[PDB]
Design a protein around this ligand. Structure first.
Ligand code: GE5
Ligand code: BOG
Ligand code: BOG
Ligand code: BOG
Length: 333
């Protein structure tokens, strides 16, 4: 067990192993405070997140368990991974705080285009998405603030920020569709790619209604092939009661863009999620010919998500989280 040291920062206490030095607060964080730091053991600059009230309730405890399970599983260049996880607690009985460590990241996709850069950035997204989707994991919330980018133009998918979420959301989500397929994320990639090509948010709807209205103006109202798969009586009536609109030609909309990029957008931004191109198929699209390598686009180990359907007590999610802290094996050097 490492030797811990204790210090207060931004009016909250921090107890971390000695290896992490020069803690500098970077923000309040999503659900916990974050500091930059220097990892003396590896030489890496890192981010340490102290989760806030991680076992306050059953929802909080399951969410804490979920976050640790996800980060421990992700082992891929274009997906955020876990350098370390620790607690100052010496036993389950006194276990109350959880700290997560990963590589320090500077800019997100907003803070960073030529067509070569769009190719490379979207390629890395799809490569990380292929890995995530292969583990039966849906991101559901892809957007530029969730994508970290180096000056190297290297990119990682995150599930947090360092830009309304609705702008990149698949339409089936905003219709509160019961089931979702992995290509909700491909829709988001399409919106992101269009923005990198035009410099403008593709669908900057003010709300969900305005959002769907903007979407339909580009892709057209559902055809009969899609209408026959809509089970909601109300959703079907409203859709059909709209003035039908034709799917625009994307060449006209994305004028001057690389025609291969326009073609890929047409295969991504399809209403019928059954017809959207998958991440694996998109990596083989001719638009990525100079980056695509089928032998270096790996899939993930299977991810056991059975816990999502369980209703457990707080102390049980806490104990399961403790098991995952204890069993952690750091990445090698
Ligand atoms: C110009 O700008 C900068 C200049 C200098 C800087 O440094 C001194 C920085 C710091 C940049 C930074 O924030 N870098 C960072 C953050 C995280 C985060 S952010 C988060 N939640 N944030 C929210 C907040 C609100 C809503 C949603 C999410 N969680 C983790 C995190 C996740 C996992 C983990 F193991 C550790 C930390 C991870 C890695 N790098 C910026
Ligand atoms: C100013 C920066 C100081 C960094 C100190 C990192 C100290 C890591 O200290 C740890 O102490 C243990 C007990 O001696 C040893 O068993 C570990 O191998 C060692 O890494
Ligand atoms: C590797 C971390 C960045 C990519 C994360 C992709 C998966 C996000 O994961 C999703 O988060 C949702 C909200 O907690 C959960 O409800 C879903 O069950 C979970 O699959
Ligand atoms: C005007 C708004 C139209 C929204 C159309 C959304 C079509 C989404 O596509 C649908 O997604 C469902 C859930 O994954 C699938 O079960 C259906 O098979 C698929 O066609």
């Amino acid at each position: 067990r490492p030797t811990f040291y204790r210090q207060e920062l931004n009016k909250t206490i921090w107890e971390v192993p000695e290896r992490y030095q020069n803690l500098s607060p970077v923000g309040s964080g999503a659900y916990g405070s974050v500091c930059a730091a220097f990892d003396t053991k590896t030489g890496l600059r890192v981010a340490v997140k102290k989760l806030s009230r991680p076992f306050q309730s059953i929802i909080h405890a399951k969410r804490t368990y979920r976050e640790l399970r996800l980060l421990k599983h992700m082992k891929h260049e274009n997906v955020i991974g876990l350098l370390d996880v620790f607690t100052p607690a010496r036993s389950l009985e006194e276990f109350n705080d959880v700290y997560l460590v990963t590589h320090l990241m500077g800019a997100d996709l907003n803070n960073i285009l030529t067509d070569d850069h769009v190719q490379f950035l979207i390629y890395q997204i799809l490569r990380g998405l292929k890995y995530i989707h292969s583990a039966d994991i849906i991101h559901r919330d892809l957007k530029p603030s969730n994508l970290a980018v180096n000056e190297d133009c290297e990119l990682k998918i995150l599930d947090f920020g360092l830009v309304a979420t609705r702008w990149y959301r698949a339409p089936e989500i905003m219709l509160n569709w019961m089931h979702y397929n992995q290509t909700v994320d491909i829709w988001s990639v399409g919106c992101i790619m269009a923005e990198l090509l035009t410099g403008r948010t593709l669908f900057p709807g003010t709300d969900h209604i305005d959002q769907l209205k903007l979407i339909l103006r580009l892709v057209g109202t559902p055809g009969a092939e899609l209408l026959k798969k809509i089970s909601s009586e109300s959703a079907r009536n409203y859709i059909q009661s709209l003035t039908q609109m034709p799917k625009m030609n994307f060449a006209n909309v994305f004028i001057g863009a690389n025609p291969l990029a326009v073609d890929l957008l047409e295969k991504m931004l399809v209403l019928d999620s059954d017809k959207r191109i998958t991440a694996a198929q998109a990596l083989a699209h001719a638009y990525f010919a100079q980056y695509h390598d089928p032998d270096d686009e790996p899939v993930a180990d299977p991810y056991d998500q059975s816990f999502e359907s369980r209703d457990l007590l707080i102390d049980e999610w806490k104990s399961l989280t403790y098991d995952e802290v204890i069993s952690f094996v750091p990445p090698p050097l």
